[PDB]
């Protein structure tokens, strides 16, 4: 019940089209659900503070309409990107 949408145009290098919301603010214990609403595949990969991929939450490929969930059980700031479009970086802030 806390959603992040990957919107139409997320595949492009435009200002518009970033993950929605770009920083999801949630309390500990929340399930986060990403949905791909774009016209191309995407995925969700946790990255470290400097933007290097790490193994905290890592989705399979998501076709249009596919979903990925992760439960955030610890306070902190979590960045993520998409391995197909690494410049698309979002955050989940758990407090």
Which residues of the chain form contacts with Cu ion (CB under 5 A)? Answer: 42, 57, 70, 82, 84-85
91 is a contact residue toward a copy of itself (CB under 8 A):
yes
In the list Cu ion, a copy of itself, none, the entry touching 31 (Cβ below 5 to 8 angstroms by class) is none
Of 26-34, 49-57, 68-76, which segment contacts a copy of itself by CB under 8 A? 49-57
Question: Beta strand pairing status for 2-6 and 23-26?
Answer: unpaired
Q: Are 71 and 34 in contact (CB under 8 A)?
A: no
> How far is Cα 93 from Cα 95, in angstroms, rounded to an integer?
6
Comparing CB distances to Cu ion, the nearer of 13 and 49 is 13
Under the rule (CB under 8 A), what is the footprint of a copy of itself?
A: 9, 11-18, 20-23, 39-41, 47, 49-53, 77, 79, 81, 83-89, 91, 93
């Amino acid at each position: 019940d806390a959603q992040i949408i990957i919107p139409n145009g997320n595949y492009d290098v435009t200002g518009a089209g970033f993950y929605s919301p770009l920083n999801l603010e949630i309390p500990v214990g929340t399930t986060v659900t990403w949905t791909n609403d774009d016209s191309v595949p995407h995925n969700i990969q946790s990255i470290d503070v400097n933007g290097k991929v790490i193994q905290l939450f890592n989705s399979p490929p998501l076709n249009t309409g596919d979903r990925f969930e992760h439960v955030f059980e610890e306070e902190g700031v979590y960045k993520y990107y998409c391995s197909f479009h690494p410049w698309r970086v979002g955050l989940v802030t758990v407090s």
